[PDB]
Structures are given as structure tokens and as C-alpha cells.
Design a protein around this ligand. Structure first.
Ligand SMILES: [Zn+2]
Length: 380
């Protein structure tokens, strides 16, 4: 196959010792992506040819979760095709791989010196530390960011990968990968993103994609939509309802300490539980989960049974860690393998629903608060 890299992949020359640091990073990236392919393709549940994914946590007509065999989606099928191509000719794919040591698009971080010390590669890349970032920010956002990043290894180690993976894709099994990828405090500076603790207690990283370490633009003239990485959300946080054009996949790694520690919601934009009104080339979606109505929309997440979920375009979704033992545990959270399938078409912006009661209530947003989501049509 023919690989065309993204335009910001620049030729590089490493010393012999530096090349070994890159190579270990690359090798663990390939394990991660091979395990990702196997997680998509290995049959589970009542699916014969691929993994069974939750696509609605509450189907309005059945009052029950709704699933689909994940490789029935053509965009997922193409991710798998492109992963197979990468794994079949990794020397060619490696031309598009870079440790992002001098990446200019935006800042990338390592959680802490403790996490940095997990690999010679991470020490060499020498990303700025999130413990320094959040000490400077201070306040309640900084307090949450310190709590997450000071305890990052413990939070991301409380995982069980034995049932749906054949190798430990967590930070324990792939420490060079998890310590060297670029971590992004995606919500820390977003005043619309809800509570201060959620904003400081959220991180993601991208192994493969238009902003990852592996940045392939096209394979055999096909645009690579795959965008694959990981997320970490501190316990006792709730996110605002989210939506966006790209389809999205989460695989839950955290082993919960109570069945309701980590709850998620995904419901299609046109679900009859919401109120929709046509807007100019879009939809206004009003969400009223008040007075306990939200509870039936949210499902428990775990690495065995409810481990896989796939979000169709503009599906409303949220991750919620306030219930149950979130009020007794410590140094815990929700850690996942994360992906989007169409990162090179339509609007990649992560959209946030907003409180119906105005900006005054952003800092307490939670599933029970009435919200408005301004969805845009995507291109066919
Ligand atoms: Zn999302």
C-alpha cells in the first residue's frame, strides 16, 4: 500500500540512542493498534463477526439499551482496513510517526515527573508537566488537576484488560506509550465545560490521528479517518452533555469499585426522549433529565459487560462519575481507549450543550439539569 503522511510530518534524523527511544515508542504504538483492531473485530455478545457495541443507552421505544455489531458501520470497517494496512507494512507507516518532541500546533504534556520517569523515551521528549501547569493555574481547577495528575499512575492502573484484550494495553503493559503520548487538559481553559473539578480532572491523548504520533493522511488514496488514543476522567465529576459530527468509540478500561462508579449516556439526536426543533441547517435539541428523569438514560460501564460503545454522528453523550462509591473512594476515575472514525471530514469541534437557565449554572451542570444542544447538519 502507499502511505501519504500529514503535512506537518517533517523528516527527522535521530542519533543511534535517540532512535532506540523512538523505536520503543513505535513498537508499543503498534501493539496498541493491533489490540485495537482485535477489539473491533473479535465477536462478542450475540454478534458473529465483530464486537457488540452499545449505540443507545436508552432506546425510547423499548425502554432498554440498544446495540449493534460495530463493524456494520462502514466508517468502522474503514478504520479496521487502515489499521490492517499499518500493521501489514509498519516500516511504511512509520514514515508518518513522530514522537512530537518539537510539535508546534499546540502544547502537549506529561502528567508528572513520576509518570515521565516510567520511560527513557518520555524523559527524553521532556514535555511540560501538568503538575506545573495546574500549580500555576491554582484555584479549584488547579486543585482538581493536581489531584488527577499527582495520582495519574494509580488512576490509570486500576484497569482490567483480561477479558476483551489479549495484551495489557493499559499503562502497566505499555508504559512507554502512556508516558510518552501527548496529554491534553482539553477542558481546563473552557469556561463552558461545566464544573471546575471536571475541567481540571480531565485528560486525553492521541496515539494515531491528525494530531497524534502516527499522522497518516491517506492510504492508497483513501483519507484516514481513524483517530485513536485514550482518556482519563477524575472520579466525582460530571460532564456536560456533548455532541459532534465525528462518530466515536469508547472502550472502558477502569475496573469499577461499585457497579455505578462510572456511568455513561449515549442517545441518538432524534431520540423521542428529547424535544427537537428544526433550526437553520440543524436541530435545536432540548434535554430535560430533571426530577430523576436522567437516571434511566445512563448505563454502568465496566471492562467486561458494558465495555464498548459507539456514537453515531451528533449522538448526545455524557460521562458521569458522581454516584455511589464516588462518595467513598479515592484516587480513582474513568479511563478508556478512545477513538473517532472520521477525523478528516465535517466539523471536528466537540460541542457542549448549555444550561437552559443560562451561563450562571455552567459550574454545576450535571445530567439532571435542563440543557439546550445546537446541532448542525453534516455533509452526506
Ligand atoms: Zn464525544
Amino acid at each position: 500500500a502507499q502511505f501519504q503522511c500529514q503535512d506537518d510530518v517533517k523528516p527527522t534524523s535521530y542519533t543511534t540512542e535517540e532512535q532506540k527511544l523512538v523505536d520503543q515508542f513505535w513498537n508499543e504504538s503498534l501493539i496498541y493498534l493491533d489490540q485495537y483492531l482485535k477489539a473491533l473485530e473479535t465477536p462478542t455478545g450475540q454478534c458473529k463477526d465483530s464486537a457488540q457495541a452499545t449505540i443507545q443507552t436508552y432506546n425510547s421505544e423499548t425502554g432498554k439499551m440498544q446495540t449493534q455489531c460495530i463493524m456494520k458501520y462502514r466508517d468502522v470497517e474503514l478504520v479496521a482496513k487502515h489499521l490492517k494496512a499499518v500493521l501489514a507494512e509498519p516500516d511504511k507507516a512509520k514514515a508518518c510517526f513522530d514522537p512530537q518532541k518539537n510539535y508546534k500546533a499546540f502544547p502537549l504534556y506529561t502528567p508528572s515527573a513520576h509518570v515521565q520517569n516510567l520511560s527513557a523515551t518520555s524523559k527524553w521528549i521532556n514535555r511540560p508537566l501538568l503538575t506545573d501547569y495546574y500549580k500555576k493555574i491554582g484555584g479549584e481547577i488547579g486543585a482538581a488537576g493536581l489531584e488527577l495528575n499527582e495520582n495519574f499512575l494509580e488512576i490509570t492502573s486500576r484497569t482490567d484488560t483480561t477479558l476483551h484484550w489479549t495484551k495489557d494495553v493499559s499503562i502497566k503493559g505499555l508504559p512507554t506509550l502512556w508516558s510518552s503520548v501527548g496529554w491534553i487538559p482539553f477542558y481546563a481553559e473552557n469556561p463552558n465545560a461545566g464544573s471546575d473539578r471536571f475541567r481540571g480532572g480531565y485528560l486525553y491523548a492521541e496515539v494515531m490521528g491528525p494530531w497524534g504520533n502516527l499522522r497518516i493522511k491517506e492510504i492508497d488514496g483513501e483519507k484516514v479517518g481513524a483517530e485513536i488514543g485514550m482518556t482519563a476522567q477524575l472520579f466525582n465529576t460530571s460532564a456536560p452533555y456533548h455532541y459532534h459530527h465525528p462518530q466515536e468509540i469508547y472502550m472502558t478500561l477502569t475496573k469499577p469499585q461499585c457497579i455505578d462508579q462510572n456511568k455513561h449516556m449515549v442517545m441518538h439526536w432524534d431520540n423521542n426522549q428529547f424535544k427537537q426543533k428544526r433550526s437553520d441547517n440543524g436541530w435545536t435539541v432540548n434535554i430535560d433529565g430533571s426530577k430523576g428523569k436522567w437516571k434511566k438514560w445512563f448505563s454502568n460501564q465496566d471492562p467486561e459487560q458494558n465495555w464498548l460503545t459507539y456514537f453515531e454522528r451528533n449522538a448526545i453523550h455524557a460521562f458521569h462519575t458522581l454516584e455511589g462509591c464516588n462518595q467513598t473512594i479515592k484516587n480513582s476515575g474513568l479511563v478508556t481507549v478512545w477513538a473517532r472514525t472520521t477525523a478528516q471530514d465535517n466539523n471536528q469541534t466537540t460541542q457542549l450543550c448549555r444550561p437552559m437557565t443560562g451561563a450562571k449554572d455552567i459550574k454545576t451542570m450535571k445530567p439532571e439539569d435542563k440543557a439546550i444542544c445546537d446541532l448542525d447538519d453534516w455533509k452526506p
